[PDB]
Structure 1
């Protein structure tokens, strides 16, 4: 590529995409925590026999 003098190459991070990805990742993490909690309430129920 060619060099442009007097200019800087800024970052390529789009904030809207990052925010929506953060939201969906939070929901997925909560779902995984929920199934973790279910496996225990199952192990605890088996223990209380």
Structure 2
């Protein structure tokens, strides 16, 4: 396509989408940590008999 002199392209990012993705990623990371903790406890109860 045609070019345009005297102009520069933007960063093509959206702050709101990035913020909501950050929140969802944090929640998912904590949810996985909950599974890790559950596995830790379920093995600790078995090893201790």
The TM-score, its normalising length taken from structure 1, stands at: 0.95
Gaps of 5+ in 2: none
- Residue 39 of structure 1 and its aligned partner are, at CA, apart by 0.5
User: Which string of whole-angstrom CA distances, capped at 9 and with x for unpartnered residues, describes residues 3-49 of structure 1?
Assistant: 11100001101110000000000000000000000001000000110
Segments of 4+ in structure 1 off by > 6 A?
A: none
SS of residue paired to 2:12:
coil
Q: Distance in 2 between matches of 1:8 and 1:19?
A: 25
Gaps of 5+ in 1: none
Q: Indicate the RMSD between aligned Cα atoms, in angstroms.
A: 0.5
